[PDB]
From a paper:
Class B1 G protein-coupled receptors (GPCRs) are important regulators of many physiological functions such as glucose homeostasis, which is mainly mediated by three peptide hormones, i.e., glucagon-like peptide-1 (GLP-1), glucagon (GCG), and glucose-dependent insulinotropic polypeptide (GIP). These ligand-free complexes share a similar intracellular architecture to those bound by endogenous peptides, in which, the Gs protein alone directly opens the intracellular binding cavity and rewires the extracellular orthosteric pocket to stabilize the receptor in a state unseen before.
The cryo-EM structure of ligand-free GLP-1R–Gs complex was determined at an overall resolution of 2.54 Å. For GLP-1R, Gs coupling induces a significant outward movement of the extracellular portion of TM bundles. The peptide-binding pocket in the ligand-free GLP-1R exhibits a more opened conformation than those of the other two receptors. For GLP-1R, residues Y1481.43b, F2303.33b, M2333.36b and R3105.40b partially occupy the orthosteric stie and form hydrophobic interactions with K1972.67b, W297ECL2 and L3887.43b, as well as π stacking with W2844.60b. Although ECL3 of the ligand-free GLP-1R swings out of the peptide-binding pocket, the extracellular portion of TMD is maintained in a conformation close to the active state, because several residues located at the orthosteric site form an interaction network to stabilize the TMD core.
Residue numbers in the entry:
A (entry chain A): 12 to 64, 207 to 253, 263 to 394
B (entry chain G): 7 to 62
C (entry chain N): 1 to 126
D (entry chain B): 3 to 340
E (entry chain R): 136 to 207, 219 to 424
């Protein structure tokens, strides 16, 4: 009795063709969740990657398209909408490393909460220790002591695998890798073999954050593909 | 400040306090009566015959 | 009705000790995570310490590490904070908080501005 | 003077609790103990709807019990024909993050909201046959969690700013504001008489509001964590709420107290969706353990289980005639059960 | 003495193909019967499984049917020539489907994003269509420039290289892909959480898992490395080649259908659903 159901099947086939075209684009791009706090410089990073290519920022590197979602005009109780980002390919967590005030403890607690969330146990985190110049100035001034808020820093030494930029004070690189290891301890405390952390030392004048994000996403996708093959 | 918020909260609590409440047994009986009234018309309680089942 | 009541605050000379008790009602105590936060002049909510369900895993902030003790008694539905060798910058309102989800390791929005499952808090001045 | 007001508030709450305790002369354990259980409600999937790229997060049934609307995080609002699994419509969204969708009682309009804090309303019955956005209601400062069409030209939206709102579509400006929740309002349900509505929030509390006059008529507590779902009983004198404490509670408006508790020892996953049957005897709830449960509302026992979803069940709905039950989960698949 | 050695090789050969055929049939049924393990990777795996089944069936036919019809004429009946052509096509299809496995893995690990439908169609065409492009010319040149003789003896090597050169090319490309993937895995492990000596055990396990999927053993110990033929080493080389070729299908099926965590998880979910309904 094909009188109208032919028309609805034609409509279905057109809708399926449009959906296939949309799917060819949806999974050809990587979605990133940008997270941070006040005086963390995430807006500066946003304008950095926007000028050179909720709020949406589309940029492209090496013919690969990245969508970055910066949550805005929302309350401070993120226990509910964060579940909307369970399928994000990466969470770019930006923290001001010179805000120890002692705002680093709160940043560490939010990082721990994100890492231990049951709906984010599969999403890797790209760590951005922003505002490195401010940290260097603070360390060289010597007015503020890191051990005041983190006593264990009094018994900390530079890691062997450290690769400081030439001309750097041993004190500033000590503090920098101490903050990095403070984050990495929480990173490696749990969640083994399913998601990883990619710390970086960024700043306002830094200009390769886009390439850093591209490389980290490339590594994440390669690791996921290797895991699907039971090969890594 | 918080004085206005506390005043609004206590006013709402006082307004919600004085209502004509009824015994829980009456509500239970009403729910039972409603459930028994529409038992025949509920295809979930009584699986509809496949002859008139649109999802067969 | 979730309810968390704090007690045991007051005024103590520097270097003293205090005990803060936190009574919970309206819910099961042993199925979730407890923690202590504080709010001092210089407006801001900061996480002080946290304790898991059984109480085996306890974590402290850097400022009070080696100075404070935390405990929980599920039999009496209560939480305890023992404060030793008080310092002038410890004056704050202490809130006995808990993040909502039972049987979870994550713990969100405890230090939020308008948290729902946070107690009224108690004053601790030195 | 604040402290005295605090003691006044706490003593008023104590008086309310004492009155509620006095009003409860019995409990449903022995009132319905002489009722034969419904046995086992064995349901099998009849249709499986596919096409969503990302996870389906909300859905709403049609008034004709034939058409469905489903919202997915990929940025798609798909209207299906349940009988023949035919995709009637597929509307792209400006913002990919959609957390709710509603279907108008007349079937002319469809609404959706999300992290953009904007409720977009699309007119399906257009002149040219192409669905385009007809209205964009804005004004919430938090994510819009649920919307339900009161009728044409009126809609109720609950948001993440701890407020609900009743809007006027053609004017585009909200007419009534419902405030009093201290947490994220997560779900809405319109009463059968279209005069009251219940909203559960992320503070272990639900509230009955009068839409006409616009303030919290009644409040109910008892849950242990954030309430994620709520729906009216078919009689209109009761409702059911599911929360993250892995328990469901049935409340009665006239009793103004906790009435029934549906829970199990081996269930430690929160409830994400709650819905009733046509007769109200079966309460259907979606859980985080990837499967839905079907309780006997008058007996508080597991009368049925729906399994077949590879991820958490996010949305759940029952037809107006009660003929079928639709479940949508995070595996991008929506299933029909009967 | 030769005769018992040949008997042992024949029986192990038949046992290897029988077990491979059974395991591949079970694996194909498992992959096609759950409706959840329907990724493009699983589609390519199913095509490789079908190719292995076809090769095993072709070898079974060429042995059993030919022996039965010759012992209990056929050399010029026009049938055995077609049977041999189908056998050659099956072997080429198996080699090129191993090549397709390797190329798809390399594309995933190197190329960012490719369109699923077009690239999948390209893989299907490469797996099944490309072998014909050198199988059919081999048949026509054998017919035109060589006697019939049931098309078994390879008199002139020139008429046989056109069926061996593409196989060697596929094997070489698979070896290169194997080397690249092993290098990628080493780079990923030597940068992780430092792990430990496991960096070895894990690398060895990954290499052993990848060996049968890409068919790398031909480069390893068939015609390149020191493994050669001698008075007594020829017997060992032939034995290991025959055994590994027979058991390659079984190893692939075990490693990618019965050991994969996704399949076991789906089986557990189905068992729990059966418990719930009953």
């Amino acid at each position: 009795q094909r009188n109208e159901e032919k028309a609805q099947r034609e409509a279905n086939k057109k809708i399926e063709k449009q959906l296939q075209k949309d799917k060819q684009v949806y999974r050809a791009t990587h979605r990133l969740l940008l997270l941070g706090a006040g005086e963390s410089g995430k807006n500066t990073i946003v304008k950095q990657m926007r000028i050179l290519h909720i709020f949406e920022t589309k940029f492209q590197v090496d013919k690969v398209n990245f969508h970055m979602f910066d949550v805005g005009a929302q309350r401070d109780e993120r226990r509910k909408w964060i579940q909307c980002f369970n399928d994000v390919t990466a969470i770019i967590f930006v923290v001001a490393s010179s805000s120890y005030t002692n705002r680093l403890q709160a940043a560490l607690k939010l990082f721990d909460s994100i890492w231990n969330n049951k709906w984010l146990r599969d999403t890797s985190v790209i760590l951005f220790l922003n505002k490195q110049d401010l940290l260097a100035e603070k360390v060289l001034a010597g007015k503020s002591k890191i051990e005041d808020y983190f006593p264990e820093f009094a018994r900390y030494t530079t890691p062997e695998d450290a690769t400081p930029e030439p001309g750097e004070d041993p004190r500033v690189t000590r503090a920098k890798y101490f903050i990095r290891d403070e984050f990495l301890r929480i990173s490696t405390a749990s969640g083994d073999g399913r998601h990883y952390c990619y710390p970086h030392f960024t700043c306002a004048v830094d200009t390769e954050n886009i390439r850093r994000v591209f490389n980290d996403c490339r590594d994440i996708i390669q690791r996921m593909h290797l895991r699907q093959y039971e090969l890594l | 400040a918080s004085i206005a918020q506390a005043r609004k909260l206590v006013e709402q609590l006082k307004m919600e306090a004085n209502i004509d409440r009824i015994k829980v047994s009456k509500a239970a009986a009403d729910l039972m009566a409603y459930c028994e009234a529409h038992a025949k018309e509920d295809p979930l309680l009584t699986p509809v015959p496949a002859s008139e089942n649109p999802f067969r | 009705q979730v309810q968390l009541q704090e007690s045991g605050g007051g005024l103590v000379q520097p270097g003293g000790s205090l005990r803060l008790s936190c009574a919970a009602s309206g819910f099961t105590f042993s199925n979730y995570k407890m923690n202590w936060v504080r709010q001092a002049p210089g407006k801001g909510l900061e996480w002080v310490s946290d304790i898991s369900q059984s109480g085996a895993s306890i974590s402290y902030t850097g400022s009070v590490k080696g100075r404070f003790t935390i405990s929980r008694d599920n039999a009496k539905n209560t939480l305890y904070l023992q404060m030793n060798s008080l310092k002038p910058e410890d004056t704050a309102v202490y809130y006995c908080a808990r993040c909502p989800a039972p049987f979870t390791r994550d713990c969100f929005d405890v230090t939020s501005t308008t948290y729902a499952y946070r107690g009224q808090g108690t004053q601790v001045t030195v | 003077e604040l402290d005295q007001l605090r003691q006044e508030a706490e003593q008023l709450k104590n008086q309310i609790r004492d009155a509620r305790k006095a009003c409860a002369d019995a409990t449903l354990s022995q009132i319905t103990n002489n009722i034969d259980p419904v046995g086992r409600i064995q349901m099998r999937t009849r249709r499986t709807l596919r096409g969503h790229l990302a996870k389906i997060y909300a859905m709403h049934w049609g008034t004709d019990s034939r058409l469905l609307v489903s919202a997915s995080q990929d940025g798609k609002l798909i209207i299906w024909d349940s009988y023949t699994t035919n995709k009637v419509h597929a509307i792209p969204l400006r913002s990919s993050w959609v957390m709710t969708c509603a279907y108008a009682p007349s079937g002319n309009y469809v609404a959706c909201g999300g992290l953009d804090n904007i409720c977009s309303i699309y007119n399906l019955k257009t002149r040219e046959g192409n669905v385009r956005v007809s209205r964009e209601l804005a004004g919430h400062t938090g994510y819009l969690s649920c919307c339900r069409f009161l009728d044409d030209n009126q809609i109720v939206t609950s948001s993440g700013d701890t407020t609900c709102a009743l809007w006027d579509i053609e004017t585009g400006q909200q007419t009534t504001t419902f405030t009093g929740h201290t947490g994220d309002v997560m779900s809405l349900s319109l009463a059968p008489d279209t005069r009251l509505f219940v909203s559960g929030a992320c503070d272990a509390s639900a509230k009955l509001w009068d839409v006409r006059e616009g303030m919290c008529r009644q409040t109910f507590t008892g849950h242990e964590s954030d309430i994620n779902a709520i729906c009216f009983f078919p009689n209109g004198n009761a409702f059911a709420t599911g929360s993250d404490d892995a328990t469901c509670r049935l409340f009665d408006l006239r009793a103004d107290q906790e009435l029934m508790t549906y829970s199990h020892d081996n269930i430690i996953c929160g409830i994400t969706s709650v819905s009733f049957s046509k007769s109200g005897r079966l309460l259907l709830a979606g859980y985080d353990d990837f499967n839905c449960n079907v309780w006997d509302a008058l007996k508080a026992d597991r009368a049925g289980v729906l399994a077949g979803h590879d991820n958490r069940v996010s949305c759940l709905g029952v037809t107006d005639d009660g003929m079928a039950v639709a479940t949508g989960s995070w595996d991008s698949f929506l299933k029909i059960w009967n | 003495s030769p005769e018992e050695q040949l008997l042992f090789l024949y029986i192990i050969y038949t046992v290897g193909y029988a077990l491979s055929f059974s395991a591949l049939v079970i694996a194909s049924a498992i992959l096609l019967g759950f409706r959840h393990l329907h990724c493009t990777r699983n589609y390519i795996h199913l095509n490789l499984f079908a190719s292995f089944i076809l090769r095993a069936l072709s070898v079974f036919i060429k042995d059993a049917a030919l022996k039965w019809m010759y012992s209990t004429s056929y050399q010029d009946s026009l049938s055995c020539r077609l049977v041999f052509l189908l056998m050659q096509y099956c072997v080429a299809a198996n080699y090129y489907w191993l090549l397709v496995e390797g190329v798809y893995l390399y594309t995933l690990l190197a190329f960012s994003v490719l369109s699923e439908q077009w690239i999948f169609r390209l893989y299907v065409s490469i797996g099944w269509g490309v072998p014909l492009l050198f199988v059919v010319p081999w048949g026509i040149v054998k017919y035109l420039y060589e006697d019939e003789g049931c098309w078994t003896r390879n008199s002139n090597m020139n008429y046989w290289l056109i069926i061996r050169l593409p196989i060697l090319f596929a094997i070489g490309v698979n070896f290169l892909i194997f080397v690249r993937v092993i290098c990628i895995v080493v780079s990923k492990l030597k940068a992780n959480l430092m792990c430990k000596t496991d960096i070895k055990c894990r690398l060895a396990k990954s290499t052993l898992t990848l060996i049968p999927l890409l068919g790398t053993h031909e480069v390893i110990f068939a015609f390149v490395m020191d493994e050669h033929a001698r008075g007594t080493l020829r017997f060992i080389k032939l034995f290991t080649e025959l055994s590994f070729t027979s058991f390659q299908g079984l190893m692939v099926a075990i490693l990618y259908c019965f050991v994969n965590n996704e399949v076991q998880l789906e089986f557990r979910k189905s068992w729990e659903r059966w418990r719930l309904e009953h």
